[PDB]
Design a protein around this motif. Structure first.
Motif, short mmCIF file in Angstrom:
data_model
loop_
_atom_site.label_atom_id
_atom_site.label_comp_id
_atom_site.label_asym_id
_atom_site.label_seq_id
_atom_site.Cartn_x
_atom_site.Cartn_y
_atom_site.Cartn_z
N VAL A 136 0.91 -1.13 0.00
CA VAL A 136 0.00 0.00 0.00
C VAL A 136 0.97 1.19 0.00
O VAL A 136 1.76 1.36 0.93
CB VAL A 136 -0.92 0.05 1.25
N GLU A 137 0.96 1.97 -1.08
CA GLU A 137 1.85 3.12 -1.18
C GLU A 137 1.19 4.46 -0.84
O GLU A 137 -0.01 4.68 -1.09
CB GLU A 137 2.43 3.21 -2.59
N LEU A 138 1.97 5.30 -0.18
CA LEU A 138 1.59 6.67 0.16
C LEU A 138 2.60 7.36 -0.77
O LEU A 138 3.77 7.54 -0.42
CB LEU A 138 1.85 6.96 1.64
N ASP A 139 2.17 7.58 -2.01
CA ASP A 139 3.02 8.13 -3.06
C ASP A 139 2.92 9.65 -3.09
O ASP A 139 1.89 10.20 -3.45
CB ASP A 139 2.58 7.52 -4.39
N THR A 140 4.01 10.31 -2.72
CA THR A 140 4.04 11.77 -2.66
C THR A 140 4.37 12.48 -3.96
O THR A 140 4.07 13.67 -4.10
CB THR A 140 5.04 12.27 -1.59
N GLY B 264 2.19 5.81 -14.85
CA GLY B 264 0.84 5.54 -14.38
C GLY B 264 0.30 6.25 -13.15
O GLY B 264 -0.86 6.03 -12.80
N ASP B 265 1.12 7.04 -12.47
CA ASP B 265 0.63 7.76 -11.30
C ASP B 265 -0.36 8.82 -11.74
O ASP B 265 -0.22 9.38 -12.83
CB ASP B 265 1.76 8.57 -10.64
N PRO B 266 -1.39 9.09 -10.92
CA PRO B 266 -2.32 10.14 -11.33
C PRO B 266 -1.56 11.46 -11.09
O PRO B 266 -0.46 11.44 -10.51
CB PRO B 266 -3.49 9.95 -10.36
N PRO C 78 -0.61 13.67 -5.40
CA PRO C 78 -0.16 12.69 -4.40
C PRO C 78 -1.34 11.72 -4.25
O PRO C 78 -2.50 12.12 -4.36
CB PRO C 78 0.02 13.55 -3.15
N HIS C 79 -1.06 10.46 -3.98
CA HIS C 79 -2.14 9.49 -3.91
C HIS C 79 -1.77 8.29 -3.09
O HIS C 79 -0.60 8.06 -2.78
CB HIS C 79 -2.44 9.01 -5.33
N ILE C 80 -2.78 7.53 -2.70
CA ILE C 80 -2.54 6.29 -1.99
C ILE C 80 -2.92 5.22 -3.02
O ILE C 80 -3.82 5.44 -3.85
CB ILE C 80 -3.36 6.20 -0.68
N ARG D 79 2.90 0.03 -10.68
CA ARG D 79 1.74 0.61 -11.34
C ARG D 79 0.51 0.12 -10.58
O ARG D 79 -0.01 -0.97 -10.84
CB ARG D 79 1.71 0.20 -12.82
N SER D 80 0.10 0.91 -9.61
CA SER D 80 -1.03 0.60 -8.74
C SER D 80 -2.28 0.08 -9.44
O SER D 80 -2.70 0.62 -10.46
CB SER D 80 -1.42 1.83 -7.92
N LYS D 81 -2.88 -0.95 -8.85
CA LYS D 81 -4.10 -1.53 -9.39
C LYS D 81 -5.26 -0.58 -9.12
O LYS D 81 -6.23 -0.56 -9.88
CB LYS D 81 -4.41 -2.88 -8.72
ZN LIG Z 1 1.94 5.87 -7.33
#
Ligand SMILES: [Zn+2]
Ligand SMILES: [Ca+2]
Ligand SMILES: [Ca+2]
Ligand SMILES: [Ca+2]
Ligand SMILES: [Ca+2]
Ligand SMILES: [Zn+2]
Ligand SMILES: [Zn+2]
Ligand SMILES: [Zn+2]
Lengths: 237, 237, 237, 237
Positions: D7-11, D18-20, D23-25, D33-35
């Protein structure tokens, strides 16, 4: 009147009110007519174990019932309990017999409820575990025919001296303290309950079942809820 | 009348009734005149933490009080609670003010009680944890001036709008469910309690203190127990 | 070499090394010659339960052993473990047989350790519970003849196919993760352990016993510690 | 090589992988590449709390991240972990920095895992809680730049004396003992993890994030996994 959410271990198929043609486990949301059911291979005279879990993120009430050396049965239902129950509730066990009968013995019961707030480390919790019941169990509210102490067990329905279950019986046991299931700043609320039971009947067709339930704090046994109504509902609607 | 066992965090030295000449922690067995005390370096305006432990094998009630970055204070007393308290009790927190005053704020409170029977795996347990209190905390019995919800805290004694503590105040909070501390087949009974508090006073001499207590289930605030009596005892004997 | 603190369930009286003339429970601090013992009415073939408790405020190690439908035995000893053991330790179970034998079967084992710091809400905890052991239990370090998986149990000493216990056997099982029992800012450290066991022997004189122990993390079975030395001590001093 | 569920806390938004654009979880199943992802209103310099829950009946991994006085973010993903991970795993925390940086400080971490078997009362459990980390934390495996003890915290990535976070850093901390997540007779397996973190950066664009992960027991930091790969994946596929 009462708001009831229950997981039933229904031993008698009342096909006229929606029960499938076999013993089953089901999820009842304000009605005895289960929203979801699963076939349950009930074992007369054996001690079984039921596990019930739920959390406010997933909003899915799930239950698993098993007997030693056997495959389990499981049933799940997507339901947001915040929309069904009040923020303060009482939890309990209920059981009944009608023309057909069985013992509805509870040997142990545990429950854990957690409310995690958005405040760092803010966790409110309640947990109780009974592996033995005494004659004067002050932390339980016993309703109807329910009694404690006999062999250290909780007998939800009437059983005579010789151990024989009686018909047209209904009894419930609720934990004394109200349980907080919703709070404005909670980010996640969850609960898990486990109980072991012994359903035994001298008949080929035992009835009627045991149910774990959550209700408004002042819930009482509805008039005429013996038999198929499991001591939870006033009618079969 | 009431049977009280308490651990006091006594902020005001009433040397005329046996208090030592400084703030102290003490163990009170049916009397405000502590059986044992220890000097307590109380810190006005700081959040402290109290831990209370006891088990039926050792029969020793011990308490530790600490503040962050400081050395703690501890007090112990050999006492068999089976000989002092009934088998069913209620646990709570009490506090008072008199001519001198202070806020008696509780920020969190946890309690765990266990009864292990001689039956294999027979454990009965009760555990609650409050890290946040709401305005309508249905699982707490509030007596006297005690209120919940203000900043998510439990205010044991009267505090006016501007945050100022009021004198001649007394309040208690007990957990709703009775607690079983003795059972005929128990081989070991134990409990542990923890609470964090904030005692603040605009005066150089704050009073009167906070106490964690265990009493008969129907305990109520004794008449005239404000001030030095901590809302627990009817007199100073 | 190893630093050992153990609670022994000694089934064979070796009066030549200080054992009393009957089966007994004892507290061993760095020596097989128990600092304190209590008569233990051992029941061949019955499942028993041992409870061990300790906290750094009271500095008293206590143990209670019981069988269903029977009175328990208890032994206590005042000892400051901070002065005996290192701050990081491993906990485990040990057992042995010599010329006389018995099965040293463990059916379940739980342990809880807590370190409460002076920081508000600073609690470090470790808890494990095994009610079933598998053939490949990766979180246990098995030493000597100890094996897991047979009937979901942990067999500390050698048992042949036909269920018969073998002589001159020794085995231990330690939990994989080191346990922190002291920390500079801890105001209270405590632990509690519980295990159920089944000692069965075809002989009138079973031997040698089972022990719950705490040791330096790298502890290993001392050479020649079968029999009376319980797989814990290198000699009888 | 390694099997990772995280579970990533991507800053930092790496839109090229693929990141939106914010910042996202996210829930990562064997790929960076988060599902599934959810917008996360990250607060530079504030202590946040992440909660992760999962059970084998529902087969849904859910996470909730919140900051005091703010609305939380939540993300869920239907996944059967039995089909992704081995039966024995290790759990941990990972973090990285690249050209952009931030402190990846962990203030507390708790984890609970339960395996309930079809045997009556057969529950195997593991629980640990760290509210304080010491310089020599023997129950944690530290990899890369991760260190403990600084202010009683766990610093996953390099921070210089003056408190400034360093770039191109990667570090992970795994709990010492393997965790059993599947067993042939388990009727329900579940786990819950909670950790509080402090992400602070002197820059307007902090990077790269923190992740709670579950992996094969022998997992190690993949070569070149600094920056966007969060110390978990060898590449961006
Ligand atoms: Zn991410
Ligand atoms: Ca029916
Ligand atoms: Ca006083
Ligand atoms: Ca001996
Ligand atoms: Ca990214
Ligand atoms: Zn039905
Ligand atoms: Zn006093
Ligand atoms: Zn001995």
């Amino acid at each position: 009147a009462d708001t009831i959410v229950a997981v039933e271990l229904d031993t008698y198929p009342n096909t006229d009110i929606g029960d499938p043609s076999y013993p089953h486990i089901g999820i009842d949301i304000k009605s005895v007519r289960s929203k979801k059911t699963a076939k349950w291979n009930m074992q007369n005279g054996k001690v079984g174990t039921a596990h019930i879990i739920y959390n406010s993120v997933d909003k899915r009430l799930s239950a698993v019932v098993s007997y030693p050396n056997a495959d389990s049965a499981t049933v799940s239902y997507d339901v947001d309990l915040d929309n069904v129950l009040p923020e303060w509730v009482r939890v309990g066990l209920s059981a009944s017999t009608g023309l057909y009968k069985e013992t509805n013995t509870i040997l142990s019961w545990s429950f854990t409820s957690k409310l995690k707030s958005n405040s760092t480390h803010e966790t409110n919790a309640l947990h109780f575990m009974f592996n033995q019941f005494s004659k004067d169990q002050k932390d339980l509210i016993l309703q109807g025919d329910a009694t404690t102490g006999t062999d250290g067990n909780l007998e939800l329905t009437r059983v005579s001296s010789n151990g024989s279950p009686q018909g047209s019986s209904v009894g419930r046991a609720l934990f004394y303290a109200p349980v907080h299931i919703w709070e404005s700043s909670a980010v996640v609320a969850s609960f898990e309950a486990t109980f072991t039971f012994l359903i035994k009947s001298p008949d080929s067709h035992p009835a009627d079942g045991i149910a774990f339930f959550i209700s408004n704090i002042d819930s009482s046994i509805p008039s005429g809820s013996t038999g198929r109504l499991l001591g939870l509902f006033p009618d079969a609607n």
